[PDB]
């Protein structure tokens, strides 16, 4: 039997997803999530498909940015594992919070 060591497929995935630009969240889940949120704001709305595509581009771009900063926070704490305390520190210094 052959088994990669923990961290190997991770590094290879970093290389794989940093080389690509395709959207990383599947499309239908993200669309339903958009309709749920917007419905809780106003009822009886529809969406141009390009509006959900804008939303999803903006979102993945925001989250990937945030994981960059989260990861700098783990490493600052001498860790390799991103934790919620890392994310929360990123968002507090970004001034999105607290």
């Amino acid at each position: 039997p052959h088994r990669y060591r923990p961290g190997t497929v991770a590094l290879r995935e970093i290389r794989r997803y940093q080389k690509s630009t395709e959207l990383l969240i599947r499309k239908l889940p993200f669309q339903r999530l958009v309709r749920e949120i917007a419905q809780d704001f106003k009822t009886d709305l529809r969406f141009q498909s390009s509006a959900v595509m804008a939303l999803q581009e903006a979102c993945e771009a925001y989250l990937v940015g945030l994981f960059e900063d989260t990861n700098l926070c783990a490493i600052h704490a001498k860790r390799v594992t991103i934790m919620p305390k890392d994310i929360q520190l990123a968002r507090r210094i970004r001034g999105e919070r607290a």
Binding site: I14, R15, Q18, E57, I75, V80
Partner: protein, 106 residues
């Protein structure tokens, strides 16, 4: 006779239209005849710089056609365009491949 102001300024970008958008956009009641010339110049210049660096990255990806990934590589590897677009998102740009040193194996 009839020759456009873009020609009289030596420009690829349309001085007339930049003048109409200036008048029609509520920046001030009146637009000197010099302001759209100089603006259309700066816009053409920055378009030229971006396309320059994007074309370069498209030619190291061995492809004919600039795609957003290429604009994104151009912006983020150039220091000053990067800052100009610090708070901007290129749809379908991706990120710059960068792995923190300490995550590499030993």
């Amino acid at each position: 006779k009839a020759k456009t102001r873009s020609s009289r300024a030596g420009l690829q970008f349309p001085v007339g239209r930049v003048h109409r958008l200036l008048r029609k956009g509520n920046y001030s009641e009146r637009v000197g005849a010099g302001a759209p010339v100089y603006l259309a110049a700066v816009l053409e210049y920055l378009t030229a710089e971006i396309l320059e660096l994007a074309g370069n990255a498209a030619r190291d990806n061995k492809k004919t056609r600039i795609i957003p990934r290429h604009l994104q590589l151009a912006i983020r590897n150039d220091e000053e365009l990067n800052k100009l677009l610090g708070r901007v998102t290129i749809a379908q740009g991706g990120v710059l491949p960068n792995i923190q040193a300490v995550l590499l194996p030993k």
